Symmetry: D2
Subunit: 232 residues, 4 copies
């Protein structure tokens, strides 16, 4: 085996175990603030933040052909000056180490218009042409066109708690989101082949975009947990 | 703190850390077989099995007024000779140590017709008068009338994987069930106050009933995991 | 695999997950008090206490021939009215489920004069004919005659912290005792074959005796931790 | 809290979560080989290897004034062409992120002749003027002059297993080394104040040197484990 794992109940400004890209930063108040905001705290359009964890993860193994199993979780929120007009979303993902930001807005900073090898779970607020009705949750295997999605019952300014799981044995990825304040929950599950989708080593992180021409909503990540196993 | 936790990938016949009630037994093949069956393997009506874990759990504390947080999981299946005619269901629960079986069939062995202090998560196959349309999943706080339920997309003879969580801090209980074979999943969540619902010490286990006049479906528990924390 | 594990930072009077034998009891003040004492708090001679954990442990497996690996720890102390005159000792051990107390004093309640299948780590204060000079630590495989022992640098009324390990793979048992207050430590290690020494299922606990004709020292167990794994 | 932790049962050549300094490298055969050797496999004098783990560790906190507790372990060996002539040693340590190698041989690559803020546990084979008789184990707080040491019963070409612990609460560091093949073990313990000794963030790793004018012994690290907690 080969294992790793970490937990933070807060973000520490300037923490060396993290890598901030784009607009992303950490507040004195221990928030991971992915997008840029007004003094009033209002979001700025055409914004983009990413955040990754420094140590790369050994997700699969060529010789052995072994596949890691992982799990992650994190508390997060959003702020929408106007809830009738949201965009663009937030995502948790896995990418090559070298990873850098891609297209914004609708592409959630993870994908570029044409065809990085990315695996992602999206929390989408905005109906692109490829999107389904309503904000939803989706699995993204090398495309902004989710292989599966599900209605997401978002709640502005309220804390959502998230759970992600990868069962190597079934090759089945599961995502669940719960809002304790509203006693509400959504889940989603599908199969993903790590191997054909990613490099043996990856980096994980968060991505988030605001509306192109609109402010839509900010995206703050409050806490974060991760564990992984890779067997013999 | 005070913690406990256990995991089994199989059941061992005659294992001393378990307590079998009613029809319940463990197969040579490491299954926990809750209800009785034909040679052909068909279920016998009016059957009832319970199974508990020996060590009692310290779920809450009077002096401190502290509340445990727990989580559990287990792989399970069902066998329905005839899928048009199912009953009665399966449940995971928490009860007083002294606990013994109650009414069968529709009462899932946990509750008696009139008004034990029981907390349960049910997997219900049968529309009682108190039930909602379709097999579902529900939270049972001292009553067979779920405070909340959700459509359960059962699949006969297929393995379902289950997850239960209790967040003391939010007092929010979450139940998720996933069927990897069908890439299908359901979740459900609501608040439950341990304190007002149960004794400081409890025992946990499984309950399962067959149709009164029908065979409906058997209920086998394949594996089992549990962890709990009780703080200062 | 098959795993279990538990931790207590205090003892709860009347806790159902424990079994008290002999003089042993739990104080309002959360101590596990193995031997009997004066109002003044002085120990009573010819005293004997044992304490076990309720759930039995699956230490080895016949079919598979698999062996568990475990580890334990606990904070403990002793009280000697007169340090020139100590007896008799304290022990942590593994026994058959059925286990009941044996001979006292020098036999630490675990062994009887002539030849239960017991494995124990002793903290011996008293030179029996079979003992070596000075209080020591020893490994006891079915005999009060340690297969190995080591000088123990005891310190009255001071808290000692203990560590026990069993590496199934090497079949090597290790015991370390440290006294933080005095920046002092002892270790001891040797091989033990679980299989030939014990039953597939065992119960673990503590034993402790006072001097036959003397008071010697009391033995209180403050905290306790245990984890075990048994593989496929 | 804030936690991290990792385990490897082998080293992967070119693994990105590690940083190799000096002569240090990883063998096809998954060894971490700290010093340089002959084709015959014999060690080369005046050699030096270091190895660190990439992610930095948050060992203590200014605001809170909280101190982490950690533990580590690793399997290691040594090869001495001639056991009458050994040098120079191996060490596990904590340093500033920026850390780079210091003086070799007797200084184990961690310290320079005159007075980096380093905390280390040494496995010393060579009697310097500051050393005590015999190979030993020692605690090094900002000096190659151990604040405490203990006889180390080394065994050439044999696998030693090591354990390191830091109890923030007692501020007591413990080191134990065991050689299963020989049923032999050594322990050592003393207090160390993280705060006054190191920066809030540190990097951990291994260091190892060969004899100045002699080959002495090689130093290979086989496996490695680490966990840390930093509280609120
Ligand atoms: Ca979209
Ligand atoms: Ca029903
Ligand atoms: Ca004795
Ligand atoms: Ca030296
Ligand atoms: Mn979408
Ligand atoms: Mn129902
Ligand atoms: Mn003895
Ligand atoms: Mn030295």
């Amino acid at each position: 085996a080969e294992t790793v794992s970490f937990s933070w109940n807060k973000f520490v400004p300037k923490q060396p175990n993290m890598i901030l890209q784009g607009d992303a930063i950490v507040t004195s108040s221990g928030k991971l603030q992915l997008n840029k905001v007004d003094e009033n705290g209002t979001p700025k359009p055409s914004s983009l933040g990413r955040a990754l964890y420094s140590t790369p993860i050994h997700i699969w193994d060529k010789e052995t052909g072994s596949v890691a199993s992982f799990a992650a979780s994190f508390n997060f929120t959003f702020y929408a000056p106007d809830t009738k007009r949201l965009a663009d979303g937030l995502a948790f993902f896995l990418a090559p180490i070298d990873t850098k930001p891609q297209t914004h807005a609708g592409y959630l900073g993870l994908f570029n218009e044409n065809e990085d090898q990315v695996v992602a779970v999206e929390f989408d607020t905005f109906r692109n042409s490829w999107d389904p009705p309503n904000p939803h949750i989706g699995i993204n295997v090398n495309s902004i066109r989710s292989i599966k999605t599900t209605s997401w019952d978002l709640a502005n300014n309220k804390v959502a708690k998230v759970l992600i799981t990868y069962d190597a044995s079934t090759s089945l990825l599961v995502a669940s989101l719960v809002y304790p304040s509203q006693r509400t929950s959504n889940i989603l599950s599908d199969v993903v082949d790590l191997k054909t989708s990613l490099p043996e080593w990856v980096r994980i992180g968060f991505s988030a975009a605001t509306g192109l021409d609109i402010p839509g909503e900010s995206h703050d990540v409050l806490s974060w947990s991760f564990a992984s196993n890779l067997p013999h």
